Ligand binder design. Structure first.
Ligand SMILES: Cc1nc(N)nc(-c2c(Nc3ccn[nH]3)nc3ccccn23)n1
Length: 819
């Protein structure tokens, strides 16, 4: 009764009932629910109670030069508040919070929490290595901390608990509601590669079509590898329906018996085409009925090395594969070659696979190599179905620190879509790291929940993983998650209702919104909740007066909240946009790559001032967007002066009038230069550079940033318009334009050092979140195969294209958004 009620809370928290067995043909999901019990308990029993409660957010990376140049006399100042008294203290960058606390005790046990935030400076780490400190230095802000009690670890209380050939019988297909022809195609797939293919005879396409044909494949039973898929597709010639069935299940048993599989409808490659899940809609979907009842030369070395050196998108010829395989032992000495090598494996040949597993027993070089995320991610994509191969990637991932896990978390969750089985090393890894650390666990929740809400293809899998995490995260976080879920469900209903009620926000609309928000505040809207994109902030009451409906196409809600923390230094509100219509999954992915790009630039001592705003997709074409404060649209700035034609002087004028002093205006101009360069490089590489300037914003302190990334004739590589160059003092060249060009080149070249990582992430993004030719764009953008000097000029030329095209492209967009 109590256990049954606890499951209902989980169901409401998850957004899917994991105990549901209406859409299964076996027990893989249950087996996985049972399988994850140990991994969960083990991490729960192993984590340090104190450090888990306080979740310090630290890094082992060096402090970049641009942050060292901001600290003088090897002295960082910290302000310590208590009750109504605060004192500034001189602290060395190398000091530990424990050593700092002894100073504020001798000078005249407690813990140092960040003022206005659930964020604690604790543990055996130098204060320079705390993220919040690094954040403070970055923005020239003082470190305000409060001396108070460590949270009670008791709050994280966890509740106690054969030589024959293979063949398939195609009985027939049926559709509830449909003179063309139709045929069934059956494929034995492994890692995108097709091992064997058979076809039924084409028949008239009616509501029921029977074949009763044994389709005999050329592959033997013994030759079938683990993770092999029977992929069943229906062509009428165009594809209409597909469904998959693992030939060897979770218990290493060959699949036998009768199956009636409800298939997926088609809207080139897509992660959804790989799913082992069946269509839950029995009432409306097509189904299929089946029956199963069964040492080297110098020239070659150069040839080999060339292959290894090619990018992850360069396809291998049979010649290249036969070369890699024959010299596998030599290939094994090169971590970089593992993806290509393991793609040269004939997986439909048992004795070859045996050799492959023996080859993986000689992993000395792999184990010893420095972790390479791009390389590691390559082995976790759709090209690799083998659990043993995939496990060596997850093994490399084990050495990542929390800081780094957070950088890659989203696409690691997405990568689970490429796993053949519900239980996998990667699933256990994510489960492990989320239970170890509250921040990773917070975002894991939202990432898993995002897919569960809008992916029928993977919700079952992801829902099982989420239940596993929620059963170990502890009572306190379960309370936080519940609070958060209640708030967003409430505000999503309001979002859709207002939208339902001409792109002119009428008087009666503004009235209705104010009404609905007041009625929530009084009723069940909890006094406070963690901000989903910023788990360190607690949002209090709605600041109703400041809430409005935006005069945009999709009519999004502009919401502002009080901070629940009374120790907050400011009276700043928390701004959240709730929107329906944009696919915010696409925003999430792009934003995540932007953060990775920022971390790449830090390693070369660059700060290009990107503003990768918080964003959490909560369902189909719906979610939340962090409001960047003091920010307006480049279009609106043009609208206010001109109306509808574009003037060059306007933007530089805007920065002047929004600046109090000359010193700050110079700082605003510098930030523009750095941030404009940052977005020019990032967007160009990503193929999202050609944007209408309604989708480009700038802060009152000069920080340019792109927004609304979902769903992306004269063309432009990026947006560097005449108004942008006028701020830089050009119409010719300038000290600011020279610096802009200098930053661009350095930023462009810095990304190219990480070519493989970017190609893979972009590649995975398109497969999980959006053909081959779309993916290949990034190779040309990253000028693979070209030296640096030649690459420098390439991007220099892209700047010149923008200068030549002036206002043409922008003007065209304006016309396009006038129909
Ligand atoms: C990150 C951010 N900050 C601000 N101030 N505004 C927005 C924003 C956005 N952002 C956004 C991100 C993704 N879709 N939309 N859309 C609108 C529409 C009207 C007015 C403002 N916005 N986004």
């Amino acid at each position: 009764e109590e256990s049954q009620a606890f499951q209902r809370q989980l169901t409401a928290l998850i957004g899917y009932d994991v105990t549901d067995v209406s859409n299964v043909h076996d027990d893989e999901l249950e087996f996985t629910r049972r399988g994850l019990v140990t991994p969960r308990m083990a991490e729960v029993a192993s984590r340090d109670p104190k450090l888990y409660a306080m979740h310090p957010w630290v890094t082992s990376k060096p402090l970049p030069e641009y942050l060292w140049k901001k600290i003088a006399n090897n002295c960082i100042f910290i302000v310590i508040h208590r009750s109504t008294t605060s004192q500034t203290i001189k602290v060395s960058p190398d000091d530990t919070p424990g050593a700092i606390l002894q100073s504020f005790f001798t000078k005249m046990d407690f813990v140092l929490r960040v003022c206005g935030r659930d964020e604690y400076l604790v543990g055996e780490t130098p204060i320079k290595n705390f993220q919040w400190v690094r954040h403070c230095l970055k923005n020239g802000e003082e470190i305000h901390v409060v001396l108070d009690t460590p949270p009670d670890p008791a709050l994280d209380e966890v509740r106690k608990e054969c030589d024959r050939k293979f063949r398939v019988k195609i009985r027939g297909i049926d559709i509830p509601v449909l003179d063309l022809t139709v045929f069934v195609e059956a494929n034995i797939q492994h890692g995108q590669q097709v091992l064997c293919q058979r076809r039924t005879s084409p028949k008239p396409f009616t509501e029921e079509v029977l074949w009763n044909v044994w389709l005999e494949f050329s592959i033997k039973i013994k030759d079938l590898p683990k993770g092999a898929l029977l992929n069943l597709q229906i062509y009428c010639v165009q594809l209409l329906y597909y469904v998959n069935l693992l030939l060897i299940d979770h218990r290493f048993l060959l699949r036998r018996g009768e199956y009636v599989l409800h298939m997926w409808q088609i809207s080139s490659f897509n992660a959804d085409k790989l799913t082992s899940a069946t269509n839950p809609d029995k009432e409306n979907s097509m189904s299929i009925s089946i029956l199963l009842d069964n040492e080297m030369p110098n020239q070659l070395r150069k040839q080999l090395e060339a292959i290894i050196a090619t990018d992850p998108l360069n396809p291998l010829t049979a010649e290249d594969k036969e070369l890699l395989w024959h010299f596998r032992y030599e290939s094994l000495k090169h971590p970089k070659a593992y993806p290509k090598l393991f793609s040269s494996v004939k997986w439909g040949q048992q004795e070859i696979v045996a050799k492959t597993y023996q080859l993986l027993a000689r992993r000395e070089v792999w184990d010893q190599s420095a972790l390479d995320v791009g390389l590691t991610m390559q082995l976790l994509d759709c090209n690799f179905s083998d659990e043993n191969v995939r496990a060596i990637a997850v093994q490399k991932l084990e050495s990542l620190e929390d800081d780094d896990v957070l950088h890659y978390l989203l696409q690691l969750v997405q990568a689970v879509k490429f796993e053949p089985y519900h239980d996998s090393a990667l699933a256990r890894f994510l489960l492990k790291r989320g239970l170890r650390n509250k921040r990773i666990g917070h975002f894991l929740f939202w990432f898993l929940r995002s897919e569960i809400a809008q992916s029928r293809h993977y919700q079952q899998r992801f829902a099982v993983i989420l239940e596993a995490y929620l059963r170990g995260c502890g009572t306190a976080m379960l309370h936080d998650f519940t609070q958060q879920v209640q708030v967003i469900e409430m505000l999503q209903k309001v979002t859709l209702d207002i939208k339902s009620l001409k792109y002119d926000v009428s008087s009666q609309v503004i009235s209705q919104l104010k009404q609905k928000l007041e009625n929530l505040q009084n009723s069940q809207l909890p006094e406070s909740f963690r901000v989903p994109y910023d788990p360190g902030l607690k949002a209090g009451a709605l600041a109703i007066e400041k809430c409005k409906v935006m005069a945009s196409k999709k009519k999004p809600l502009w919401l502002e909240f009080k901070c629940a923390d009374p120790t907050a230094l400011s009276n700043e509100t928390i701004g959240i946009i709730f929107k329906h219509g944009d696919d915010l999954r696409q925003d999430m992915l792009i934003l995540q790559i932007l953060r990775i790009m920022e971390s790449i630039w830090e390693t070369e001592s660059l700060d290009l001032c990107l503003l990768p705003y918080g964003c959490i997709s909560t369902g189909d074409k719906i979610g939340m967007i962090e409001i960047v404060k003091d920010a307006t649209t480049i279009a609106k700035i043009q609208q206010s002066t001109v109306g509808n034609a574009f003037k060059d002087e306007v933007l530089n004028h805007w920065l002047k009038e929004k600046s109090p002093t000359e010193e700050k205006f110079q700082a605003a101009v510098e930030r523009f230069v750095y941030s404009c360069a940052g977005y020019c490089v990032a967007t160009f590489v990503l193929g999202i550079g050609d944007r209408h300037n309604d989708n480009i914003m700038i802060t009152e302190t000069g920080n340019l940033f792109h927004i609304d990334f979902g769903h992306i004739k004269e063309r432009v590589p990026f947006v560097l318009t005449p108004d942008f160059l006028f701020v830089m003092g050009t119409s010719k060249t300038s000290p600011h334009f020279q610096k802009f060009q200098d930053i661009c080149v350095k930023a462009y070249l810095a990304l190219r050092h990480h070519t493989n990582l970017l190609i893979i992430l972009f590649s995975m993004m398109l497969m999980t979140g959006m053909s081959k030719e779309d993916i290949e764009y990034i190779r040309d953008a990253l000028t693979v195969g070209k030296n640096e000097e030649d690459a420098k000029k390439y991007f220099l030329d892209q700047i010149e294209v923008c200068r030549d095209k002036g206002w043409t492209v922008q003007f065209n967009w304006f016309l396009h958004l006038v129909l």
